[PDB]
């Protein structure tokens, strides 16, 4: 467990310097044909550095001239024999006090290295190489440009987590306010590959711009299938994301224990708020609002379903079968339990769905619905 702070030193921040080498006396690997970073490489390298400082307590300051630096960047083009090397990609040296520690090197004969802003593998390579220079040891043609779930955990173990990042209400995906290219989709042709770090506020996964059937999971540490890819989005350990918006596809939106606002969008969606007081919008289409236990919608913290469509949407209470299939009752409970009732509040046009579970002395489950609902909309 090597870091810039030493060996087996955990949770300690670092202030590091970096430098784009303009010349070298030698490359520590023995490769030759040094070429300095071009303008695009410089911009993309800084974006990679930023993606690391976003998640862990690292500060990076550029130095120039003859000043030494913790982390350095340079290209090579030839092997130790002086022959052209068009085959290799990049490498980096771990932190330490030895010559070349923290240095990272990239093959200028690779177009992805020269053009990391338009060839995604180049940006990913920068991020990856920097990870090693910091002490880390280890999708349909696209490459994630920022640290993924395990590396976020690992780098935070070394340097501590950055609790100042995006502490406001943050939106990831379409309509993003992150000012990070890897969290931003500007149109439906853009692929998203990221693991979100977010240190506070009420946040949204906006994947509204895609037509693919998506699976969006708001659980900490969980993976989502977004924009037609699989497992391309995850939520880092230590992060709570609150809201999700699906696209025009037939989606599955899985909430977490927090109070979530879930919007299915068009298409026939499945929405599962989970624990907490959730607000659910199925959107256009034949949507299903799923309840997996009495704890999903207690009276003290009940769900709202804000756009329910009688005769079109469904509410799934089949999970309650495990203690005896629910019986639907018209306007009164018997006291026997395992009963469900739809109660119409004519003054406010709200339907209250009350569910009385066996063994409960009071009716403890409620979902409030803005609109009418029928017995035949309820799956028991």
């Amino acid at each position: 467990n090597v870091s810039w702070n030493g060996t087996n030193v955990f949770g300690k921040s670092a202030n590091l310097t970096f430098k784009f080498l303009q010349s070298v006396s030698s490359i520590p690997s023995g490769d030759t044909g040094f070429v300095k970073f071009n303008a695009e490489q410089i911009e993309q390298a800084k974006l990679s550095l930023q993606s690391w400082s976003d998640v862990a307590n690292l500060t990076f300051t550029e130095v120039t001239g003859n000043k030494s630096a913790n982390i350095t960047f340079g290209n090579y083009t030839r092997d130790a024999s002086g022959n052209l090397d068009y085959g290799t990609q990049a490498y980096a040296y771990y932190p330490g006090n030895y010559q070349g520690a923290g240095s990272s090197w990239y093959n200028y004969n690779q177009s992805n290295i020269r053009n990391p802003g338009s060839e995604e593998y180049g940006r990913q390579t920068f991020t990856h190489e920097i990870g090693h220079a910091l002490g880390l040891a280890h999708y349909n043609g696209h490459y994630g440009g920022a640290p993924m779930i395990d590396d976020i955990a690992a780098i935070q173990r070394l340097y501590g987590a950055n609790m100042t990042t995006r502490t406001g209400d943050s939106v990831y995906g379409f309509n993003s306010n992150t000012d990070r290219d890897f969290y931003t989709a500007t149109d439906s042709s853009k692929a998203l590959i990221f693991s979100v770090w977010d240190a506070g506020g009420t946040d949204t996964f906006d994947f509204s711009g895609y037509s693919n059937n998506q699976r969006i999971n708001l659980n900490e540490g969980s993976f989502s299938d977004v924009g037609g890819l699989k497992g391309n989005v995850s939520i880092a350990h230590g992060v709570t994301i609150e809201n999700a918006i699906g696209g025009s596809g037939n989606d599955i939106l899985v909430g977490n224990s927090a109070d979530n606002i879930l919007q299915g969008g068009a298409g026939n969606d499945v929405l599962y708020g989970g624990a907490g007081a959730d607000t659910l919008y199925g959107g256009a289409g034949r949507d299903t609002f799923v309840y997996g236990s009495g704890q999903d919608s207690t009276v003290a913290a009940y769900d709202w379903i804000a756009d329910f469509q009688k005769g079109i949407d469904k509410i799934d209470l089949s999970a309650f079968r495990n203690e005896g299939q629910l019986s639907f009752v018209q306007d009164q409970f018997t006291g026997k339990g395992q009963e469900v009732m739809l109660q119409w509040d004519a003054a406010n046009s709200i339907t209250n769905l009350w569910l009385h579970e066996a063994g409960h002395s009071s009716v403890d489950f409620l979902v409030r619905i803005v609109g009418q609902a029928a017995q035949s909309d309820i799956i028991v």
Partner: peptide
């Protein structure tokens, strides 16, 4: 201590 990235 050097780590290589795949090409």
């Amino acid at each position: 201590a050097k780590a290589s990235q795949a090409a």
